[PDB]
Amino acid sequence: MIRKILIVEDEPQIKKLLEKTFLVLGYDVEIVATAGNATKLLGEYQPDVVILDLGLPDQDGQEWLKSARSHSEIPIIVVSARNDTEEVVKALDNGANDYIKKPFDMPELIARVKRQLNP
Amino acid sequence: MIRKILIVEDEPQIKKLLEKTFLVLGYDVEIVATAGNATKLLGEYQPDVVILDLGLPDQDGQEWLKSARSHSEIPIIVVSARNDTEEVVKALDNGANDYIKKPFDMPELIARVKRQLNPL
Ligand code: BEF
Numbered sequence: 001m002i003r004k005i006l007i008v009e010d011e012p013q014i015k016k017l018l019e020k021t022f023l024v025l026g027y028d029v030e031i032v033a034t035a036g037n038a039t040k041l042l043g044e045y046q047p048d049v050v051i052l053d054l055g056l057p058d059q060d061g062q063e064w065l066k067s068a069r070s071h072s073e074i075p076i077i078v079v080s081a082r083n084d085t086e087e088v089v090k091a092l093d094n095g096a097n098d099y100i101k102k103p104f105d106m107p108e109l110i111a112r113v114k115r116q117l118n119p
Numbered sequence: 120m121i122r123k124i125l126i127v128e129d130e131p132q133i134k135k136l137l138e139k140t141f142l143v144l145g146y147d148v149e150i151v152a153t154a155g156n157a158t159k160l161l162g163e164y165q166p167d168v169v170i171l172d173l174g175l176p177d178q179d180g181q182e183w184l185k186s187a188r189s190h191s192e193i194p195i196i197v198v199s200a201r202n203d204t205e206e207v208v209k210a211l212d213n214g215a216n217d218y219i220k221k222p223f224d225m226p227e228l229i230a231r232v233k234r235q236l237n238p239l
């Protein structure tokens with residue numbers, strides 16, 4: 001019933017806000033600040049949806065997206081300050097389920113997470 | 120970019136509702152059920168606005184308001200079931216930035232929080 005969410009974000013304020021919001025909404029939440037931790041927790045946590053930052057410190061979020069898609073089909077919503085149309089198109093084409101540009105409106109993020117968690 | 124808010128409320132239902140509301144609105148939110156926790160988090164959390172209940176268990180919210188104002192200028196919106204005009208005037212004069220009587224419409228509360236956090 002409770003849906004697990006994996007957040008891959010390196011910006012602390014946004015980590016805090018997303019964690020808090022999705023906890024209050026009744027979701028189990030895990031957060032990581034790096035792509036490697038994101039892979040390890042994709043394996044161990046077995047999440048139901050991934051929220052992915054593209055400006056990650058250790059790896060380009062696009063390449064981690066491409067890999068995770070090679071190994072999984074879990075819904076991934078990209079949330080990145082990268083607002084160039086080419087970044088959005090590459091992310092969707094690399095298999096992403098959605099793209100949200102930062103800064104965003106928390107209600108819209110929640111609505112899209114709900115859309116992905118209820119196929 | 121991220122705006123912090125501190126809620127000081129002791130009724131669980133209202134805590135839950137305000138927390139949910141202002142998290143879904145994209146605010147960082149902290150909650151306390153006592154005046155002492157409110158002071159500790161006023162110092163540590165450094166919020167951008169405080170929503171303050173006056174019917175607190177450990178201290179009269181009015182006195183906590185007076186003190187917090189003695190040491191700070193952060194916006195404080197009072198939200199209390201005390202509906203007599205005398206309480207509202209005492210709270211405003213003791214430094215409160217706004218007063219909302221319970222029961223209230225969450226839209227009015229949100230509009231006033233936005234007015235305090237983005238004073239144009
Ligand atoms: F750091 Be990513 F661009 F959100």
Ligand code: BEF
Pocket residue numbers: 129172173174175198199200201221
């Ligand atoms: F408990 Be508060 F006075 F509404």
Ligand SMILES: [Mg+2]
Pocket residue numbers: 010011053055056
């Ligand atoms: Mg970043």
Ligand SMILES: [Mg+2]
Pocket residue numbers: 129130172173174175176
């Ligand atoms: Mg009370």
